[PDB]
Amino acid sequence: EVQLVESGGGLVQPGRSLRLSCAASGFDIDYYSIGWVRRAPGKGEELVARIYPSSSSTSYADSVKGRFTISADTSKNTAYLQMNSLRAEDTAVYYCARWHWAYSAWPGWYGMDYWGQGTLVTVS
Numbered sequence: 001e002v003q004l005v006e007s008g009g010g011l012v013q014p015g016r017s018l019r020l021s022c023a024a025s026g027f028d029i030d031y032y033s034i035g036w037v038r039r040a041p042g043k044g045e046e047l048v049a050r051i052y053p054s055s056s057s058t059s060y061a062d063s064v065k066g067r068f069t070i071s072a073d074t075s076k077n078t079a080y081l082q083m084n085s086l087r088a089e090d091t092a093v094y095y096c097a098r099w100h101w102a103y104s105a106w107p108g109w110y111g112m113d114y115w116g117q118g119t120l121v122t123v124s
Contacts, residue, residue, distance in 0.1 A: 006118060036048035050070070093118040
């Protein structure tokens with residue numbers, strides 16, 4: 001089974017902190033870049049954070065930089081999202097995501113897929 005199960009979330013007052021996790025199963029995270037996408041109420045998905053476990057290279061959304069930090073633990077095949085100084089505009093459903101690129105005829109397909117069971121992060 002290929003799965004990317006999330007944990008954490010909940011109701012929180014602005015300025016407080018939350019920590020999410022992405023437990024990966026069925027595939028190695030070194031060949032992908034894993035992270036989070038958020039779905040604001042009445043909006044499509046947008047990238048939150050993304051880490052390349054092979055290089056620990058990070059990427060964040062501009063409205064998130066300086067406040068969220070993403071890290072990986074390949075020994076457990078999990079990533080972590082430390083959400084500090086939460087704001088009311090961070091209120092969304094957050095989903096564990098993964099990104100990939102592989103030629104099926106060069107240049108190939110750039111791919112993104114996220115697990116459908118997200119967690120609700122609401123800022124009071």
